[PDB]
């Protein structure tokens, strides 16, 4: 009931893990292709844990 949400903006996020997780023959993502994630621009990003 108090899930913490952090505002991320004016940044470069932790793209490295998934960017380097590219030689893998398998990818697990459905909203958007992981590979393209590092060739776009976002107005704002939300992270929840």
């Amino acid at each position: 009931y108090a899930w913490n949400r952090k505002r991320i903006s004016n940044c470069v996020a932790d793209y490295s893990v998934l960017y380097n997780s590219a030689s893998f023959s398998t990818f697990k993502c459905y909203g958007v292709s992981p590979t393209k994630l590092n060739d776009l621009c976002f107005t704002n990003v939300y992270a929840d844990s």
Partner: protein
């Protein structure tokens, strides 16, 4: 944003929509052209007579 296998669905949807639009436009133009041709034939007859 998406990858080959996913993009194809949206590509197909847009293709169907735009093809339908073109078909409607062409049919309307054909009918209008027939009408104008009838008028032009009448005008030619009026001139000759």
């Amino acid at each position: 944003r998406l990858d080959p296998p996913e993009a194809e669905v949206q590509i197909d949807r847009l293709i169907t929509g735009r093809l339908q639009s073109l078909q409607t436009y062409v049919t309307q133009q054909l009918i209008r052209a027939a009408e104008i041709r009838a008028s032009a034939n009448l005008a030619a007859t009026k001139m000759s007579e």
